[PDB]
A paper describes a structure:
Indeed, constructs D12_Hxx_D12 with H02, H09, H11, H13 and H15 yielded diffraction-quality crystals in space groups P212121, P6122, P212121, C2 and P1, respectively, at resolutions ranging from 1.8 Å to 3.5 Å. In this orientation, all four D12 units engage in paratope-paratope interactions, where two DARPin domains form an antiparallel dimer. Two such dimers pack into a barrel-like unit. The purple molecule in Fig. 5b shows the C-terminal DARPin packing against the green N-terminal DARPin, the pink molecule the N-terminal DARPin packing against the green C-terminal DARPin. Occasionally, the DARPin fusion constructs would rather distort the conformation of the connector module than forgo the formation of such favorable crystal contacts.
In this paper, we present a strategy to fuse specific, high-affinity protein binders to obtain multivalent or multispecific scaffolds of predetermined geometry. DARPins are used as building blocks to confer the desired specificity to the construct. A series of rigid connector modules replacing the DARPin capping repeats allow to combine the individual DARPin domains in such a way that their distance and angle can be altered to test different geometries, bringing the binding partners of the DARPins into a defined spatial arrangement.
Residue numbers in the entry: 12 to 317
Amino acid sequence: SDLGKKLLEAARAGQDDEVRILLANGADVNTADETGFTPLHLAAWEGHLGIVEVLLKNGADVNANDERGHTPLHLAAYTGHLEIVEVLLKNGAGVNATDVIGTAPLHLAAMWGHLEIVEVLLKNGADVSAQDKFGKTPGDLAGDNGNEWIAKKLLLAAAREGHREAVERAIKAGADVNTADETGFTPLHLAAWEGHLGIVEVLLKNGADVNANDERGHTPLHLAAYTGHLEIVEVLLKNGAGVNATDVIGTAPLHLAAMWGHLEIVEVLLKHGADVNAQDKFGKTPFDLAIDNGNEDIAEVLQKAA
């Protein structure tokens, strides 16, 4: 096992050239010392991007467990090397790998304040509601530690993915219910777009702006009529959400509801009192967009109202 101890000292030191000589000689790429660290762990700790790509292309397991239950992704979120976190994820690493306590890479990335590391985990399907042994969520790890900006980015991912439990606790921690992302989507937009009704009423009960606009003037009432979730449009209109509100292109929720074929939504929009006369920037009424699309039932229902 002399080739493995010199491989661990070469992968930790950063001499990538000695790794090439020893791997071509037949050294095990997944040799574990007394602690269980594979060369992929030590290279992800010291931050040598060159050695990691060599170990991953010859057959190093991307989910190598040490004695403490740390995968190379767990050590990649703790050090803060953004370039190393995405290389492991593209090879098929565990986005929600647990620790001895149950700590996932989403927990460690939000604990030390690595925002760009937290953002890449959320793209690869990370569970924000993942719980460890003590009952602390990355939303709790972010709001208590003092990283309120990371708590906003974590609250937004929870409303988009659909984890209802990890939301009200962050509001109890002082999180902003009207916080927006890069495009302006509040958690009210993300909850009505994916069709997860459970946050729509509880976020509405705390005091979220129902007629809030994004960077392009899109209110959450527009998104509810687009996907066709009728049970969400009824709750939004119950509180007095703007039904005649349009975006920068003049697109009303009636324009979106008539394009995709949602008869039960078009009726409830006409129930609260919406004008068919509204047009977009192309001079197109909800009647004309339903004719070319291939959906005549909506065109006939508004024709009876016109």
